[PDB]
Amino acid sequence: KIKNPILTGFHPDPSICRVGDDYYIAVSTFEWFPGVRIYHSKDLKNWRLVARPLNRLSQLNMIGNPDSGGVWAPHLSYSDGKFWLIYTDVKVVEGQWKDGHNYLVTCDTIDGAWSDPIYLNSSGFDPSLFHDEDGRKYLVNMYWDHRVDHHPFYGIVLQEYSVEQKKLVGEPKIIFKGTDLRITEGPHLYKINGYYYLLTAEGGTRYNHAATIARSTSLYGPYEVHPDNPLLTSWPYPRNPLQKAGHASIVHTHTDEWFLVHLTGRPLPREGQPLLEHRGYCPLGRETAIQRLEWKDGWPYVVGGNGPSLEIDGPSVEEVSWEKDYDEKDDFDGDTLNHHFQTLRIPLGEDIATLKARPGHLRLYGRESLTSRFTQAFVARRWQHFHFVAETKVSFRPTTFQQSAGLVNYYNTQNWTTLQITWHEEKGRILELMTCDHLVVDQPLRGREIVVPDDIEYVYLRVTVQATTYKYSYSFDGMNWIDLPVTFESYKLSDDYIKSRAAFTGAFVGMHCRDGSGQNNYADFDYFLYKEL
Amino acid sequence: KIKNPILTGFHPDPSICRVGDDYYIAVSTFEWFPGVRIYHSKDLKNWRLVARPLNRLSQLNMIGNPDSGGVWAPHLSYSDGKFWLIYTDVKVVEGQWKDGHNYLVTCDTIDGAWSDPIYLNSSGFDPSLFHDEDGRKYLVNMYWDHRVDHHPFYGIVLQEYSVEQKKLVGEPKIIFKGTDLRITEGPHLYKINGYYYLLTAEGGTRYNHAATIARSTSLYGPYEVHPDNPLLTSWPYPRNPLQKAGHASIVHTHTDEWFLVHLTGRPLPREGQPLLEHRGYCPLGRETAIQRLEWKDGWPYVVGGNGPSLEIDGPSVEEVSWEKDYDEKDDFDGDTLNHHFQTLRIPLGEDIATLKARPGHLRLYGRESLTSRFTQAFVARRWQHFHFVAETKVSFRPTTFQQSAGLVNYYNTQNWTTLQITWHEEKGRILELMTCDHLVVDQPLRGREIVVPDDIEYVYLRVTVQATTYKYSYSFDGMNWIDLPVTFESYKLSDDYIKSRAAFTGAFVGMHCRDGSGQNNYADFDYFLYKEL
Amino acid sequence: KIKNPILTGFHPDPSICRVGDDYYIAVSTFEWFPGVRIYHSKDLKNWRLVARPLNRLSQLNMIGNPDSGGVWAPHLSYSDGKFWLIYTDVKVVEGQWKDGHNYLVTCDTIDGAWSDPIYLNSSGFDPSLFHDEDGRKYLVNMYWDHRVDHHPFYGIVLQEYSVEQKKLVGEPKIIFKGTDLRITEGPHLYKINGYYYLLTAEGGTRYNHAATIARSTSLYGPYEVHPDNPLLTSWPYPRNPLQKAGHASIVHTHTDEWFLVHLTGRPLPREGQPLLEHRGYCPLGRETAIQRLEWKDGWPYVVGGNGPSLEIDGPSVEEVSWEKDYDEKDDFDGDTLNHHFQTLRIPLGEDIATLKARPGHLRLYGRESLTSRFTQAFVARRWQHFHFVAETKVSFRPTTFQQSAGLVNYYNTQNWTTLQITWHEEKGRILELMTCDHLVVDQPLRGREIVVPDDIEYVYLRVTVQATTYKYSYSFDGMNWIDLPVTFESYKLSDDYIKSRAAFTGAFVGMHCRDGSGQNNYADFDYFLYKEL
Ligand SMILES: [Ca+2]
Ligand SMILES: [Ca+2]
Ligand SMILES: [Ca+2]
């Protein structure tokens, strides 16, 4: 029935929420705006994107945020007639500190206008809101220890949240220190039988990742750990196509069944490589998967052992699937950008991105370079398959080398590749390739750039991705295409390749326009095509 | 009569401006808020701070800005009965790009409410406005080349500025490529006798720094280079106490005399070290000096060779000295912080820094770590001398290791040291040392931390800087001091030590409070003492 | 019956050989001279050093050899009335190449004058001689692939050796490529039942290490791999005190029993650290352990699962215990240095190290520094316990800072610490600490070196190692001891700390004398003491 991953491409930290017979999963979005994606399902198999809650500067202001800062793991719940969304804005992501703030927003409906944030605390990321049976509310999060002689993951902190006073009350207490896997994060609380069950993520979000579960009769512990912990992990299964299994959340369905959603990374093919030396590269980032849970002696168990199954049995409900929510060829005739498109850190107003200036075209007025954490005229969508084609049609007339416009394959500000139109003193308006690898830039078509003829209005730009490798191509007419003689490697756009280890997103493909002279020069994009192959 | 530097500690890129018998210098301030410091003098010997023009978010919004980003070289001038201040907000300071924006503000007076900014261009930093003798205005700046096969300093660009239209009009034109020293920046135009003189900075702002001058009978050139260029440089003078002489501006006094203000670095004592191997470390950063000029065959000449002299002859005027504009022991009596104190990137409101919460105390409500480019509860002043003592007295009750308050000696987010009060599980409230060196943190007193007794209201914190080294000491009663047994090295808080190259500020000393838990805990500082020894 | 490890401290790549009811283990020695250690046992429990075969420069000339070059995994066998020892001299240990040459030497007895070397090949390390039941002999080793886009471990090459002709004959052929673990290494052939069994090490000699075994009816394959492979590994057993389990050799006992000897690393205590993030630091290097085998369906199985056991049941023989073969306090009254002492790379003659010059003393005439891969006057023995004291008493009169003598804890030329006597211009004869970490040197007692009174003939030097940390101490009278106020960390002298990953030895402690002036000054060491606990 259900084949994993259920949300493919960049969809980390799944937070599942049941309301009656409707099912919702919220995922993390990091530096990508608007914040948080929420998907809806009736059967836990078929998923549609239904909300992007954090879309006002008042809720989320990420200008200047570092790569893989911003919205880390979110928590979605439903109680007292409304949804509650907890999120972080992480400002520091390297060194001894992880400075970040936790906020609560609510909405009567999933896709409404969510409230302005209530500040909660800053003591660590992965905040989660528990609604106890007695009506009381409790916030759990990881607690950050910056000290040099210490492991940073101090455990799980708990504090009561007062709905009336709109603040945390009483005194924060550590309720769980973790197991020897450490890196204890992603806390979630569940009241089942006579017990409070505390789910955590452990071992870090790379190949040692795990989901850990413990139980207590007291909300404050001590929590005893699952006798066969971890509840879930891919670490001891190096051949499993689903790696990095952890950061899970539990759903008890209306049909009295139990399921476990979690993130996973799918490494590129590694034939002829040592199995254990380096466990792979994941250009699709961390995706969402689902597993079935069964119960023994007051403990939940992943059906099929503690490793993640590629295929599972769905809940005992009717199949409810959804119509495709985007066009393979987006011709930009709508009065809104398709919701699969995102921008970096900030919303782009009509002065930067516009569908209005020229009907049938997305106009991007050139801003800063692809290395800027501030203002980029860049509109992009996730890689969601290993094998796909992406294509755009653009008219652009740069008057200086400081201006560019192109198709970008992009991981972060220091890691990206592009086929772009720019200007050259001798050759005039040209086509070139440009790559950025850990801030180091190369121009591989150096001295051999494609001259664009004065009479060509639209340049056609394409990328064809084939698992491990990809190639750029172009056309001046839309029918006859020419390969550019450079083979690119998809592993360079993966979490695992990034040397900072603050690498929590995934590859995007999109349309960019830069104007470094500040003359407000723009490019018109007639369509954007994304098609799985 | 005039001893250099005239402005000590962090005071780079002096832009001099004459209005009658009044003289003003504007210097760059980078990430430090508010933007730009303007000093006033009558005699060019004695200088007083009179303006801090960029004090509104509408003018300068640097949250998230990289270290040594923000406000680079400013340009101050006076024309048509008003002051004209040109400045940059530089967003990217490493790699192939230098994303940054150029703005103009004006004020009828030096110390009034400067206008909201008019956006100029983005083509490169070091913008300068020229007021031609016919009433037309011209902007010159550097033109940035990001290409791999190319030197970044494409030369000097010029475009007319329309006062009435509030924008640049016509087409931008490169008027000068520079000499073979390259790194052509800091352009300033002057109409003298019958020539347009173009003064540039070349060689880079390190030890190869130079001031290059050229002239043309046409504004658009071609420009002919001074026959004995550089006009000013320190490079051939390795024994000169004033290094890095460059980025100059020219004043013609009301006494028909000519001077040249310039930045300079003052390396720490390096007796016994090889003269040319490494030319020094400057913790006072780039400071402002002044040279005398003389004219020979339509060319200005720095008096006493093209190297900077330590002492010059002042202009033919009466000496006017100023009263001391800060207290040695600032007891925080005013309803405003002394103008030598600045904040990082952003203004701090009364929710973060206040003199109103506890009379005669600066209260700092704890925010993010010393590594944050976002919101730090940090109030600091420049090291302005090689030998000094700085001291504070603070009330602070931390309830967690997530909270701290202390005395900080600070270069940037990744380079600093501190004597701070925090909390320890076993020891309770404690004093400790902490250093950060290129993001790597050490805690020199780990396991040896100073236990602060419960009955102690105030902890006194002291730093004593003796040129190449400094030491922290503490006291519980204000009378009996104990040195902490660790000797620090001042060269680690210097421009020349920072491996990024983007190191354009200088050492500061100040008061910090962090609350990483988000509980709004605060520290009350009774006084701040800074005294030259 | 038997507690692991059986050979403690630096004892990697065990090659076991049975001759009747005598058992022999040879281990690798890398840059330490003489080459190869052979231990003897009757019961597999108690082991005594009996031979150091490679003691002539004709056999082993290692001057200039890089750290962790020289003698890699050896192979010891017995057939046709003599012992056969195969060894490598590895010259290149970093980069695409691993240049090294394989040699055979023979001796009628374990401890006699071994023959001069018969050169064999250079196709890759871990050579092993097989003696087929039909009186023919074949060499197996790993095949080295230097190519830029190739895994260097091409597999196992096999080739016949001819006794009469003193060389290899016929055609070389690959018999095994390995499993997905790769890094295929340490091949050994055994004829058991109707199958040839080929044993290899896979996964690399760090935490992914395994022993792999396969079988075939033909000497040339194809080899089918053990269905429950690996035969032995510590990888899926992160809590096991014995890690890196692999590079095994098989013994069949005169009692019709089967055992597997292997190398293993025992990480230092790491309480509070993430189980999987970094699996540990092993200052005792790679040690020798022993496992029991059983047979099931024509395949051998490690008794007690495929992870290594800490305690095993040895073979049904009478226990034969050995007398201690060194004095706790070696007073240097003997004619020759105790055989637990080794020198770096080369033998040291009486011109450098001698027990004859000064009765009751080991005299070292100073040579090159601790960073020299050529001639060091350095006599050292293995760290063999996590908790020990080592101590010496030395007479030394340096006349220049170019001269030193002291007690050294040493990993390689770039990684060591020492308490040493030297000379200072103003203080004169001093005692100081010095450390070297990846070539970076520190003097942590700089400016506070201990003045040695001129009337003191002997300085007493001590190190006390307590698992994760150690401290040096000194005395002038041998009764009253003062700690030097620096705590050192044992992990910095471990295989796992070394950045080059050519780190195959272990920590040593010994006596050193340097004379950088060439005045042939010397140090007289009265005793050397090593004591567990
Ligand atoms: Ca269209
Ligand atoms: Ca006061
Ligand atoms: Ca003796």
Coordinates of C-alpha atoms in Angstrom, one line a residue, chain A residues 259-529:
Chain A
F259 CA 1.9 4.7 13.1
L260 CA 5.3 6.4 13.3
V261 CA 6.4 9.2 10.9
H262 CA 10.1 10.0 10.8
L263 CA 12.8 11.6 8.6
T264 CA 15.1 9.5 6.4
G265 CA 17.9 10.2 3.9
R266 CA 18.2 8.2 0.6
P267 CA 21.8 8.1 -0.4
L268 CA 22.7 8.1 -4.1
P269 CA 23.9 4.7 -5.6
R270 CA 27.3 3.6 -4.1
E271 CA 28.3 0.5 -6.1
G272 CA 32.1 -0.1 -5.8
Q273 CA 32.4 2.0 -2.6
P274 CA 33.3 0.6 0.8
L275 CA 30.0 0.0 2.6
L276 CA 30.9 1.6 5.9
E277 CA 33.6 4.2 5.1
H278 CA 31.2 6.9 4.0
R279 CA 27.5 6.0 4.1
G280 CA 26.4 8.2 1.2
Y281 CA 25.3 11.5 -0.2
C282 CA 21.6 12.7 -0.1
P283 CA 20.8 15.4 -2.7
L284 CA 17.1 15.2 -1.8
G285 CA 18.0 16.0 1.8
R286 CA 15.9 14.5 4.6
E287 CA 12.5 13.2 3.5
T288 CA 9.4 12.0 5.4
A289 CA 8.6 8.3 5.9
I290 CA 6.0 6.3 7.8
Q291 CA 6.0 3.0 9.8
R292 CA 3.5 0.8 11.6
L293 CA 3.6 0.4 15.3
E294 CA 2.5 -2.7 17.4
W295 CA 2.3 -3.1 21.1
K296 CA 3.9 -5.6 23.6
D297 CA 4.1 -5.3 27.4
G298 CA 3.2 -1.6 27.4
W299 CA 5.8 -0.8 24.7
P300 CA 5.4 0.2 21.1
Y301 CA 7.4 -1.6 18.4
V302 CA 8.1 -0.9 14.7
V303 CA 6.5 -3.7 12.7
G304 CA 9.3 -5.3 10.7
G305 CA 12.1 -4.7 13.3
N306 CA 13.7 -1.5 14.4
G307 CA 14.9 -0.6 10.9
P308 CA 12.7 1.3 8.5
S309 CA 10.6 -0.7 6.0
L310 CA 10.4 0.7 2.4
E311 CA 6.8 -0.4 2.1
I312 CA 4.1 -0.6 4.8
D313 CA 0.4 -1.5 5.2
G314 CA -1.9 1.6 5.4
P315 CA -4.6 2.1 8.0
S316 CA -8.0 0.4 7.6
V317 CA -9.6 3.3 5.7
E318 CA -10.7 4.0 2.2
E319 CA -8.1 5.3 -0.3
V320 CA -8.4 9.1 -0.8
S321 CA -6.0 10.5 -3.3
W322 CA -5.5 14.1 -4.6
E323 CA -5.4 15.9 -7.9
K324 CA -2.0 17.3 -9.0
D325 CA -1.5 20.7 -7.3
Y326 CA 1.0 22.1 -9.9
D327 CA 1.5 22.2 -13.7
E328 CA 4.4 20.3 -15.3
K329 CA 4.8 23.4 -17.4
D330 CA 3.9 26.4 -15.3
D331 CA 3.2 29.2 -17.8
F332 CA 2.9 31.9 -15.1
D333 CA -0.7 32.9 -16.1
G334 CA -1.9 32.7 -12.5
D335 CA -2.1 35.8 -10.1
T336 CA -0.1 33.9 -7.5
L337 CA 3.1 31.8 -7.6
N338 CA 2.5 28.1 -7.3
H339 CA 2.9 27.0 -3.7
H340 CA 5.8 24.7 -4.5
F341 CA 7.9 27.8 -5.1
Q342 CA 9.8 29.3 -2.2
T343 CA 12.2 32.2 -1.7
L344 CA 15.3 32.7 0.5
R345 CA 14.7 34.1 4.0
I346 CA 12.3 36.8 3.1
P347 CA 9.1 37.3 1.1
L348 CA 9.7 39.1 -2.2
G349 CA 7.2 41.9 -2.9
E350 CA 6.0 43.2 -6.3
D351 CA 9.3 45.3 -6.5
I352 CA 11.4 42.1 -6.8
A353 CA 9.1 39.3 -7.9
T354 CA 6.0 40.0 -10.0
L355 CA 3.5 38.2 -12.2
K356 CA 1.7 41.5 -12.8
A357 CA 4.3 43.6 -14.7
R358 CA 4.0 41.4 -17.8
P359 CA 1.1 38.9 -17.9
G360 CA 2.2 35.3 -18.6
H361 CA 5.7 36.1 -17.1
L362 CA 7.3 36.0 -13.7
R363 CA 9.5 39.1 -13.6
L364 CA 12.5 39.1 -11.3
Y365 CA 14.2 42.4 -10.7
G366 CA 17.9 41.7 -10.1
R367 CA 19.1 41.9 -6.5
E368 CA 22.2 40.5 -4.8
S369 CA 24.5 37.6 -5.7
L370 CA 23.9 33.9 -5.1
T371 CA 26.2 34.2 -2.1
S372 CA 24.0 36.7 -0.2
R373 CA 22.1 35.8 3.0
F374 CA 20.0 39.0 2.6
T375 CA 18.1 39.9 -0.6
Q376 CA 18.1 37.6 -3.6
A377 CA 15.7 37.7 -6.5
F378 CA 15.4 33.9 -6.5
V379 CA 12.4 31.7 -6.9
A380 CA 12.9 27.9 -6.4
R381 CA 11.3 24.5 -5.9
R382 CA 12.7 21.3 -4.3
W383 CA 14.3 18.4 -6.1
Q384 CA 11.7 15.7 -5.3
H385 CA 13.0 12.9 -7.5
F386 CA 16.4 11.4 -8.4
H387 CA 15.6 11.5 -12.1
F388 CA 14.0 14.7 -13.5
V389 CA 14.0 17.5 -16.0
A390 CA 13.7 21.2 -15.2
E391 CA 13.4 24.0 -17.8
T392 CA 12.8 27.7 -18.1
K393 CA 12.3 30.3 -20.9
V394 CA 13.8 33.7 -20.2
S395 CA 14.3 37.1 -21.9
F396 CA 17.2 39.2 -20.4
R397 CA 19.5 41.9 -21.7
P398 CA 22.4 42.5 -19.3
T399 CA 24.5 45.7 -20.0
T400 CA 27.3 44.7 -17.6
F401 CA 29.0 41.6 -16.2
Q402 CA 27.4 42.6 -12.8
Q403 CA 24.1 41.4 -14.1
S404 CA 22.9 37.8 -14.6
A405 CA 19.9 35.6 -14.9
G406 CA 19.6 31.9 -15.1
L407 CA 18.5 28.4 -14.0
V408 CA 20.1 27.5 -10.7
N409 CA 20.6 24.3 -8.9
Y410 CA 21.1 25.4 -5.4
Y411 CA 21.9 24.0 -1.9
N412 CA 23.1 27.1 0.0
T413 CA 24.9 30.4 -0.5
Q414 CA 28.3 28.8 -0.9
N415 CA 27.1 25.7 -2.8
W416 CA 25.3 26.0 -6.1
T417 CA 25.6 25.7 -9.9
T418 CA 24.0 27.8 -12.7
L419 CA 23.5 28.1 -16.4
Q420 CA 23.1 31.9 -16.7
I421 CA 22.9 34.8 -19.2
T422 CA 25.3 37.6 -18.5
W423 CA 27.4 40.2 -20.4
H424 CA 31.0 40.2 -21.6
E425 CA 33.1 43.2 -23.0
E426 CA 34.0 41.5 -26.3
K427 CA 31.3 38.8 -26.8
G428 CA 28.4 40.9 -25.6
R429 CA 25.4 39.0 -24.1
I430 CA 26.6 35.5 -23.3
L431 CA 25.7 32.1 -21.8
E432 CA 28.0 30.6 -19.2
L433 CA 28.2 28.0 -16.5
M434 CA 29.1 29.0 -12.9
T435 CA 29.6 26.8 -9.9
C436 CA 30.2 27.6 -6.2
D437 CA 31.7 24.9 -4.0
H438 CA 32.3 26.0 -0.4
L439 CA 32.5 29.6 -1.6
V440 CA 35.1 28.7 -4.3
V441 CA 33.8 29.7 -7.7
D442 CA 34.6 28.3 -11.1
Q443 CA 33.6 29.3 -14.6
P444 CA 34.0 26.0 -16.6
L445 CA 33.0 27.5 -20.0
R446 CA 35.8 30.1 -19.4
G447 CA 36.9 31.8 -22.7
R448 CA 34.4 29.5 -24.6
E449 CA 31.1 31.1 -23.6
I450 CA 28.0 30.8 -25.8
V451 CA 27.4 34.0 -27.7
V452 CA 23.7 34.9 -27.7
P453 CA 22.6 36.5 -31.0
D454 CA 21.2 40.0 -30.9
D455 CA 18.0 38.8 -32.5
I456 CA 17.2 36.2 -29.9
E457 CA 14.5 37.3 -27.4
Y458 CA 14.1 34.2 -25.3
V459 CA 16.9 31.9 -24.2
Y460 CA 15.7 28.4 -23.2
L461 CA 17.5 26.8 -20.2
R462 CA 17.4 23.2 -19.1
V463 CA 18.8 20.8 -16.6
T464 CA 18.5 17.0 -16.8
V465 CA 19.2 15.2 -13.6
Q466 CA 20.1 11.5 -13.7
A467 CA 20.7 10.4 -10.1
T468 CA 24.5 10.8 -9.6
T469 CA 25.1 13.3 -12.4
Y470 CA 23.4 16.2 -14.2
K471 CA 23.9 18.3 -17.3
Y472 CA 22.8 21.7 -18.5
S473 CA 21.5 22.4 -22.0
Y474 CA 20.1 25.4 -23.9
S475 CA 18.0 26.4 -27.0
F476 CA 17.3 29.6 -28.9
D477 CA 14.1 28.3 -30.4
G478 CA 12.6 25.8 -28.0
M479 CA 13.0 22.7 -30.3
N480 CA 16.7 22.3 -31.0
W481 CA 18.8 21.8 -27.8
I482 CA 22.6 21.9 -27.3
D483 CA 24.4 20.2 -24.4
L484 CA 27.0 22.2 -22.5
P485 CA 30.2 20.1 -22.3
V486 CA 30.2 19.7 -18.5
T487 CA 29.0 16.8 -16.3
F488 CA 28.0 17.9 -12.8
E489 CA 27.8 15.7 -9.7
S490 CA 24.6 15.6 -7.7
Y491 CA 26.5 14.7 -4.5
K492 CA 27.9 18.3 -4.3
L493 CA 24.3 19.5 -3.7
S494 CA 23.7 17.2 -0.7
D495 CA 23.6 17.5 3.1
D496 CA 26.5 15.1 3.5
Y497 CA 28.9 17.1 1.2
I498 CA 28.7 20.3 3.3
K499 CA 31.7 20.8 5.5
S500 CA 29.9 23.0 8.1
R501 CA 27.5 20.2 9.2
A502 CA 24.8 22.9 9.4
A503 CA 23.3 21.2 6.3
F504 CA 19.7 20.5 7.0
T505 CA 17.9 21.4 3.7
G506 CA 18.3 19.8 0.3
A507 CA 18.7 20.7 -3.4
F508 CA 16.4 23.2 -5.0
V509 CA 16.0 24.2 -8.7
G510 CA 14.9 27.7 -9.6
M511 CA 15.1 31.0 -11.4
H512 CA 17.5 33.8 -10.4
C513 CA 18.3 37.3 -11.5
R514 CA 21.2 39.4 -10.1
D515 CA 21.8 43.1 -10.7
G516 CA 25.1 44.0 -9.0
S517 CA 25.2 47.5 -10.5
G518 CA 21.8 48.3 -8.9
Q519 CA 20.2 49.6 -12.1
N520 CA 17.1 47.5 -11.4
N521 CA 17.5 45.4 -14.5
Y522 CA 15.2 42.4 -14.7
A523 CA 14.5 39.1 -16.4
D524 CA 11.2 37.9 -17.6
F525 CA 10.5 34.1 -17.2
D526 CA 7.8 32.8 -19.5
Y527 CA 7.5 29.4 -17.9
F528 CA 9.0 27.0 -15.4
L529 CA 8.8 23.3 -16.1

